[PDB]
Amino acid sequence: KTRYALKDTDEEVREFLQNNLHLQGKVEGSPSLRWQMALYRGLPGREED
Amino acid sequence: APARLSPAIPLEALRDKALRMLGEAVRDGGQHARDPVGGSVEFQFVPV
């Protein structure tokens, strides 16, 4: 969203779709990030490994 | 009179309680709970 706001189009998004890799931070980095990971992992209706 | 002596308490039981208290405190700190024992990190860590 901020890239789109900073004068970018769909071509730039496609080119930079795999540029970022460090965004997948550890689950212990925040006191509430464990809850989000737990709900995203351990639910029958939400399975994404 | 040779003054008096300080009152005595069970040293081993107090030491065991202090050890388990510090263990619980460090476990809570590792778990990163939002509710401190004394309402702040100071009142949880400094006295023990």
Resolution in angstroms, to 1 decimal, for this deposition? 4.0
Specify the 3-state DSSP secondary structure of B12. Answer: helix
Instruction: Write the single-letter amino acid at B45.
Output: F
**What is the b/e burial string over B16-36, where b = at least 16 CB atoms within 10 angstroms of the residue's CB?**
eeeeeeeeeeeeeeeeeeeee
List, in sequence order, every residue forming a beta bridge with A43; answer none if it has no partner.
Answer: A46
Name the nearest CA neighbour of A4 among A16, A19, A18. A16
The Cα B37–Cα B35 span in angstroms is 7
Which residue stretches of B1-48 are H helix?
11-31, 41-45
Interface of A with B in 7-26 (CB under 8 A): none
Range B17-26 contact pairs with CB under 8 angstroms and sequence separation of 24 or more: B18/B48, B21/B48, B22/B48
Map residue A43 onto helix, strand or coil.
Answer: strand
Distance between A31 CA and the closest CA of chain B, angstroms? 6
User: Best mutation site among B28, B31, B32, B34 for testing chain A: the one with the most A CBs within 10 Å?
Assistant: B32
In sequence order, the 6+-apart residues with CB closer than 8 A to the CB of B29 are B45
